[PDB]
Amino acid sequence: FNILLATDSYKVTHYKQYPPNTSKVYSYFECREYEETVFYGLQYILNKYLKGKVVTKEKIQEAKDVYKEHFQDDVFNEKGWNYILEKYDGHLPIEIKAVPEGFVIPRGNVLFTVENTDPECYWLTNWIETILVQSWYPITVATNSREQKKILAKYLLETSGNLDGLEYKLHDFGYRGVSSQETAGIGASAHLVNFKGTDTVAGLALIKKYYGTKDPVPGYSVPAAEHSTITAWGKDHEKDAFEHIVTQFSSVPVSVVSDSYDIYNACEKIWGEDLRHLIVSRSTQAPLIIRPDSGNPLDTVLKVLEILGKKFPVTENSKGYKLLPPYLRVIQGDGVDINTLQEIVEGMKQKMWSIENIAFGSGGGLLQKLTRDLLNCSFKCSYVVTNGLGINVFKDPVADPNKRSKKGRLSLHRTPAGNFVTLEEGKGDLEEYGQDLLHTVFKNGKVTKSYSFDEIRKNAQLNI
Amino acid sequence: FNILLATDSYKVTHYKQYPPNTSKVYSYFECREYEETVFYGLQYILNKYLKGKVVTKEKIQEAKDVYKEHFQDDVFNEKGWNYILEKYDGHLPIEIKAVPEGFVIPRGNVLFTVENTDPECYWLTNWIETILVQSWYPITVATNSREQKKILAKYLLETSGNLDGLEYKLHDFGYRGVSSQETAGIGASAHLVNFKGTDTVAGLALIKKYYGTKDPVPGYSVPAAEHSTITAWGKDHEKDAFEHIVTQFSSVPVSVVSDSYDIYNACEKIWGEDLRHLIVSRSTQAPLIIRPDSGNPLDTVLKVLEILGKKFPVTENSKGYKLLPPYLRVIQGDGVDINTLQEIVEGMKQKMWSIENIAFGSGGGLLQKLTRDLLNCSFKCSYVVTNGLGINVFKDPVADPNKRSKKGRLSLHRTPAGNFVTLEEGKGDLEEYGQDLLHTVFKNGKVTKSYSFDEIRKNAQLNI
Ligand SMILES: O=P(O)(O)OC[C@H]1O[C@H](OP(=O)(O)OP(=O)(O)O)[C@H](O)[C@@H]1O
Ligand SMILES: O=P(O)(O)OC[C@H]1O[C@H](OP(=O)(O)OP(=O)(O)O)[C@H](O)[C@@H]1O
Ligand SMILES: NC(=O)c1ccccc1
Ligand SMILES: NC(=O)c1ccccc1
Ligand code: BEF
Ligand code: BEF
Ligand SMILES: [Mg+2]
Ligand SMILES: [Mg+2]
Ligand SMILES: [Mg+2]
Ligand SMILES: [Mg+2]
Numbered sequence: 039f040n041i042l043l044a045t046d047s048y049k050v051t052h053y054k055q056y057p058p059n060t061s062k063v064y065s066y067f068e069c070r071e072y073e074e075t076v077f078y079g080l081q082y083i084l085n086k087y088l089k090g091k092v093v094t095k096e097k098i099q100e101a102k103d104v105y106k107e108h109f110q111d112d113v114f115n116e117k118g119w120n121y122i123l124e125k126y127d128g129h130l131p132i133e134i135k136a137v138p139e140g141f142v143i144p145r146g147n148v149l150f151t152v153e154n155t156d157p158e159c160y161w162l163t164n165w166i167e168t169i170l171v172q173s174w175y176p177i178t179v180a181t182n183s184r185e186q187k188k189i190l191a192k193y194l195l196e197t198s199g200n201l202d203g204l205e206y207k208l209h210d211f212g213y214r215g216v217s218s219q220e221t222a223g224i225g226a227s228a229h230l231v232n233f234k235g236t237d238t239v240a241g242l243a244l245i246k247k248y249y250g251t252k253d254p255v256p257g258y259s260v261p262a263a264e265h266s267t268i269t270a271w272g273k274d275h276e277k278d279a280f281e282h283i284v285t286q287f288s289s290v291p292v293s294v295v296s297d298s299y300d301i302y303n304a305c306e307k308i309w310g311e312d313l314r315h316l317i318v319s320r321s322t323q324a325p326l327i328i329r330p331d332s333g334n335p336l337d338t339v340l341k342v343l344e345i346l347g348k349k350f351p352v353t354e355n356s357k358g359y360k361l362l363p364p365y366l367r368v369i370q371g372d373g374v375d376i377n378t379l380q381e382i383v384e385g386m387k388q389k390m391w392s393i394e395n396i397a398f399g400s401g402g403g404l405l406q407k408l409t410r411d412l413l414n415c416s417f418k419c420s421y422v423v424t425n426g427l428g429i430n431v432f433k434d435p436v437a438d439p440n441k442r443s444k445k446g447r448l449s450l451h452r453t454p455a456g457n458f459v460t461l462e463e464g465k466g467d468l469e470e471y472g473q474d475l476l477h478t479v480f481k482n483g484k485v486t487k488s489y490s491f492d493e494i495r496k497n498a499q500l501n502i
Numbered sequence: 503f504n505i506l507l508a509t510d511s512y513k514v515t516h517y518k519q520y521p522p523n524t525s526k527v528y529s530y531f532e533c534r535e536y537e538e539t540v541f542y543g544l545q546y547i548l549n550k551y552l553k554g555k556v557v558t559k560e561k562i563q564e565a566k567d568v569y570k571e572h573f574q575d576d577v578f579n580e581k582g583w584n585y586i587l588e589k590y591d592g593h594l595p596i597e598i599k600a601v602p603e604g605f606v607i608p609r610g611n612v613l614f615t616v617e618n619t620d621p622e623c624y625w626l627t628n629w630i631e632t633i634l635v636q637s638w639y640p641i642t643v644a645t646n647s648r649e650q651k652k653i654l655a656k657y658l659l660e661t662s663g664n665l666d667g668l669e670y671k672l673h674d675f676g677y678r679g680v681s682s683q684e685t686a687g688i689g690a691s692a693h694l695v696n697f698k699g700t701d702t703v704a705g706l707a708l709i710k711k712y713y714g715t716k717d718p719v720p721g722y723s724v725p726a727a728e729h730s731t732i733t734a735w736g737k738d739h740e741k742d743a744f745e746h747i748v749t750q751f752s753s754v755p756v757s758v759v760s761d762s763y764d765i766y767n768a769c770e771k772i773w774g775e776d777l778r779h780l781i782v783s784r785s786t787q788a789p790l791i792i793r794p795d796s797g798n799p800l801d802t803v804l805k806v807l808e809i810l811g812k813k814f815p816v817t818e819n820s821k822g823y824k825l826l827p828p829y830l831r832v833i834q835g836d837g838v839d840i841n842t843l844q845e846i847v848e849g850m851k852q853k854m855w856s857i858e859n860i861a862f863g864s865g866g867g868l869l870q871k872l873t874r875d876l877l878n879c880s881f882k883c884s885y886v887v888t889n890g891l892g893i894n895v896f897k898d899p900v901a902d903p904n905k906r907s908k909k910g911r912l913s914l915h916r917t918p919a920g921n922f923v924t925l926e927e928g929k930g931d932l933e934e935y936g937q938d939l940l941h942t943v944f945k946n947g948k949v950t951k952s953y954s955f956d957e958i959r960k961n962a963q964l965n966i
Contacts, residue, residue: 039683046677047701047723048757054750055731057743063730087683104706107718111754113725164730171678213510214635214881215874219503219551220684237511242568254571259511261577265907266527266628266883267519269895279519286518290575293512300900333901402873409866410679417678419730431733436764437797443729 041092042101042119045168050105053115053161061157062423065164066448067173068460069413071146071440076184076498077137078231079176080150082224082248084134084485087169091483093119093128121158129483131156132166135476137450139489140231140497142184145413147460148448148476149177152417155482160422167417174415175221178408179228183208184498186376186400187232191500193383194393197359201502208379208398209235210257211371212405225405230256230491231498235397237262238405249491256491261286262293262329269298277308284316284326293327293369301330305342310349318350320365327367327397335373336385342368343391359392371399375407418443420462430463449474505556506565506583509632514569517579517625525621526887529628530912532924533641534878534904535610540648540962541601542692543640544614546712548598548949551633555947557583557592585622593947595620596630599940601914603953604695604961606648609877611924612912612940613641617885619946624886631881638879639685642872643692647672648962650840650864651696654857655966657847661823661856665966672843672862673699674721675835676869689869694720694955695962699861701726702869713955720955725750726757726793733762741772748780748790757791757833765794769806774813782814784829791861795836800849803834807855823856835863839871882907884926894927913938 056063069075098119105114122128136150137143152170154163190207194200210229216222219240226241227249236242236257245256263283271279276298283294296304309317309328317326328346330338346362353361362368370382379400383393420443422431430446449466451474453459459471466474479487489497520527533539562583569578586592600614601607616634618627654671658664674693680686683704690705691713700706700721709720727747735743740762748756760768769792773781781790792810794802810826817825826832834846843864847857883895884907894910913930915923915938923935930938943951953961 043703043707044683045703046675047703048726048728051725051751052728052731054725055727055743055747057735057739057746060734063734065730104703104719108703108706108721108723109725109754110722164728168678169683172680172682174679175681211510214632215638216636217639217680217870218636218682218684218688219508219633220682224682239507239509239511239568239572242572243507255568257572258574259572261515261518261573262512263519264512264516264628265897266529266895267516269897270524270527270883270886270888271521272893272895275521279521282521283519287515290573297899297901298897302900332899332905338901402875406681407873408681409871411866419734422734424734429736431730431736433729433733433762435761435796436766437761437802441796 039087040097040100041087042097043104044087045165047108049165049168050115051113052164053118056160057424059425060160060422061426062153062421063160063163063419064151064153064421064447065167065417065419066148066151066444067170067415067417068148068444069145069177070416072181072185072413074142074144075177075413076180076231077141077143077149077177078139078180078228078494078498079173079224080136080479081139081488082176082244083169083173084480085248088130088166088480089483089485091128092130093123095123098123115161118158118161125156126483130162131159131482132162132480133478134480136479137475138477138497140494142498144458147458148444148450151448151476164419171410171415171417174410174413175408176224176228177415178412179225179405180231180498181413182376182408183229183232183404186379187500189376189380189383190393191502193387197357197387197392198355198394199357205234206397208233208400209369210238210241210404211399212401213238213240215401216405229404231494234258245491249489249494251491260291260293263295265295265298268295273299276304277312280308281313281316284313289321289324291325291327293329295329295331297331301332301338302341302345305345306349310345314349317365318363322364325365325367327369329369329371331372335370335378336381339368339370339382339396340385340389343395355392355394357392359390361392362395367397368395369397369399374398374400375403420444420448421446450476503551504561504564505551506561507568508551509629511572513629513632514579515577516628517582518577520624521888524624524886524888526617526885527624527627527883528615528617528885528911529631529881529883530615530908531613531634531637531879531881532611532908533609533613534880536645536649536877538606538608539641539877540644540695541605541607541613541641542603542644542695542958543637543688544600544634544943545603545952546640546688546708547634547637548944549712552594552630552944553947553949555592556594557587559587562587579625582623582625589620590947594626595623595946596626596944597942598944600943601940602961604958606962608922611922612908612914615912615940628883635874635879635881638874638877640688640692641879642877643689643869644695644962645877646840646872647693647696647868650843652964653840653844653847655964657851658857659966661821661851662819662858663821669698670861672697672864673833673835674702674705674868675863676865677702677704679865680869686869693868695959698722709955713953713958715955724755724757727759729759729762732759737763740768741776744772744777745780748777753785753788755789755791757793759793759795761795765797765802766805766809769809770813774809778813781829782827786828789829789831791831791833793833793835799834799837799842800846803832803846803860804849804853806832807859819856819858822854824854825856826859831861832859833861833863838862838864839867884908884912885910914940
């Protein structure tokens with residue numbers, strides 16, 4: 039990895055475009071006006087990519103050679119990079135202040151600020167815009183996952199009177215559905231801010247290396263079938279496949295995909311009659327988890343529940359909702375996103391089924407079908423020093439008021455009613471609003487303040 | 503990186519679920535039934551993740567300890583992985599056959615097959631499903647980027663009579679808007695299959711290392727401003743910023759973002775009057791490229807062109823379309839995806855503006871707003887040998903015939919009309935359709951067949 043080659047190409051030319059006599063460029067990130075966002079993932083980027091000796095003679099030469107060919111021209115700021123190598127032994131003269139990881143912040147507030155600590159390095163602040171803005175991704179996954187947690191909490195509480203098992207109700211299925219190995223780990227770690235169930239193994243190492251937990255691992259799985267393990271037995275032998283698998287995993291929870299040929303027949307005839315004796319004997323700690331995986335997600339869940347409620351003893355919980363026996367549960371892992379998850383839990387409640395009966399698995403919906411535009415994540419220059427005088431800078435495009443940026447030096451505060459406000463134009467220095475919530479997390483090549491994964495989960499909790 | 507920890511958790515339990523005495527699992531990838539897809543990116547995966555000694559005593563021990571805690575149990579196949587280390591020096595006993603990279607193949611055809619080459623490693627075929635399925639991402643970037651080229655080609659030909667400079671008409675802006683560094687390199691490389699203009703630098707090194715080009719680099723950029731480099735001058739000095747920047751880059755193309763406060767004023771008054779003398783003196787090889795960046799994409803482009811058409815000497819080309827002078831162009835890089843790209847060029851044609859006048863930048867729409875479901879990318883077991891008997895396997899869910907999978911040993915063929923057909927159930931062996939078009943690209947830890955980025959580009963060309 040070479041930080042000199044990890045920026046937008048045009049940024050290589052910006053050192054020639056800023057006003058002459060500029061000693062400071064100060065910039066910030068917001069989720070510009072999903073009304074509150076979980077701030078998570080910066081600490082990964084600081085440690086992986088930004089800290090320590092990030093400039094060498096060799097990286098400067100490599101970048102010089104690449105850009106000469108890429109631009110067909112000599113624009114690369116070799117002198118500038120060489121200055122960092124010589125003066126700071128290749129450590130970035132940059133200060134970053136950030137809201138603590140896990141904090142839940144309303145849209146349109148400063149989440150982090152970036153400035154150069156040496157007047158020579160005025161061009162560096164926005165050099166690293168590209169890498170820092172990629173923080174949009176763990177923010178958005180963390181945020182969208184917690185929004186699904188809110189829906190789940192709401193309906194579980196209404197239909198059952200409590201929140202037991204909430205943290206295992208949305209399982210990460212997204213390893214194959216994301217764009218790379220690196221994305222898989224980052225995305226999976228972001229979902230684990232809110233939940234404990236994951237099949238995206240990549241998230242575990244990332245958390246362990248960059249954040250840390252008191253517990254051995256941040257996330258858990260159970261044995262589960264896929265279509266190749268059912269279909270390999272041949273179409274006439276689905277029953278043999280189910281029997282083999284549940285007997286193999288007789289003492290732990292086991293998920294068994296049941297829609298290879300006909301989900302309704304598998305529920306009613308195979309699980310519900312032929313193998314019923316191998317199900318009713320299971321423990322509460324080792325249920326059979328039937329997994330439908332096709333058809334309209336709502337229609338299918340409701341029909342599976344209807345089938346099972348006719349073949350197995352249903353109870354009615356204290357809220358008046360129907361409950362399968364403890365040895366039997368359902369996971370819907372197909373077509374799951376925040377919209378369809380809401381549609382399913384609502385349709386269930388309508389039909390008097392407890393949300394206790396159901397869990398969800400989500401791949402693409404959870405980890406891939408998200409953009410930097412969902413929370414309008416943007417990084418803008420708001421303050422510069424030119425000729426030793428500070429000036430408040432911003433954009434305000436005529437045809438789009440929603441692209442207006444903030445002015446001057448920024449700080450984030452609690453309001454008297456306990457909300458948040460971002461103070462502009464260095465007004466936080468007036469101290470009318472208690473103390474700035476942004477803390478220095480990076481300064482001059484060093485990570486200066488870290489958060490464990492345990493503190494992040496605590497910060498990101500739901501109210502209730 | 504540890505391949506033992508690079509699969510969906512459930513697959514760790516699958517070796518216990520297959521029928522007893524299974525010696526072969528054979529699987530395949532297709533873009534299940536955007537009618538044609540560019541096959542690109544498997545070779546990156548083969549080289550980075552799968553080839554060579556990918557199993558060591560330490561990776562086995564690492565995986566063992568992680569899974570013990572992740573499953574709260576001993577499920578991990580320590581013995582099977584030890585067998586691979588001991589028998590093959592940690593090289594994967596796997597054969598992969600694939601269509602050549604760059605090939606443009608209709609939906610619902612076999613793209614690659616995977617099978618184990620040791621009866622003991624029947625469980626390994628689908629172990630590596632997760633990692634290979636991520637090939638969806640470069641396939642989908644390459645395909646959607648090629649779909650945009652087809653639109654650009656059609657309107658450029660229609661408005662101008664030729665395709666000159668088509669390869670620079672869609673510029674990659676998506677580095678900040680993807681989910682990771684790795685993703686950035688992968689997606690940017692996929693875009694470079696069709697085009698030559700990129701600001702995502704990460705794409706260059708990936709191509710150079712994994713594919714190779716004749717040319718020093720596969721992609722090019724030009725100097726361009728961002729809002730920080732305009733706004734840093736102060737709102738009253740937008741002219742000084744513009745003058746400084748074009749004068750710094752007087753002899754190369756320069757892109758100047760012009761919407762910081764008022765795009766229409768910037769075009770009509772600042773570029774069209776105050777700084778006009780510095781524009782009309784520029785070379786054809788060094789145009790000013792005005793970049794609007796807000797407002798309704800189509801309405802803004804038309805209005806911008808209308809403004810410039812009144813301030814600068816417009817000609818009419820040989821097709822009857824209006825053309826700006828050669829020292830002046832426009833690039834629209836806000837809100838660009840394949841739908842809005844189509845709307846703008848069509849709206850331009852309607853107003854008699856040559857597509858020669860315009861280029862596009864795209865970030866999220868190009869590299870991030872895409873999922874594994876856009877081309878329905880799926881990997882399925884189609885053939886197993888159990889007790890020495892080969893059997894053709896598939897799924898066919900009742901409520902979704904679009905999830906039906908293919909049966910048996912597969913091959914890809916030309917039809918007599920020169921189209922593509924995928925033959926099932928070993929029927930390729932009958933020789934009635936000529937030769938299988940898949941080639942062995944990986945076998946037993948070695949990459950056995952390879953393509954340069956130049957062969958890939960040539961394979962991925964448009965018919966035009
Ligand atoms: O939320 P998603 O990204 O869809 O991931 C979840 C789906 O992924 C797996 O199957 P896959 O989609 O690989 O195959 P299928 O379409 O044939 O079920 C799984 O069985 C779910 O169906
Ligand atoms: O296609 P996209 O992924 O949107 O990327 C392209 C956009 O990104 C950059 O600005 P940015 O979006 O960072 O800030 P802005 O929204 O204030 O223009 C660029 O100036 C384009 O507007
Ligand atoms: N455990 C599962 O059911 C699963 C399915 C697909 C992808 C990931 C996990
Ligand atoms: N060169 C550009 O205008 C650009 C803008 C945004 C991101 C990348 C590149
Ligand atoms: F494992 Be199945 F084809 F979703
Ligand atoms: F660089 Be601008 F804020 F799109
Ligand atoms: Mg599935
Ligand atoms: Mg934007
Ligand atoms: Mg912009
Ligand atoms: Mg699917």
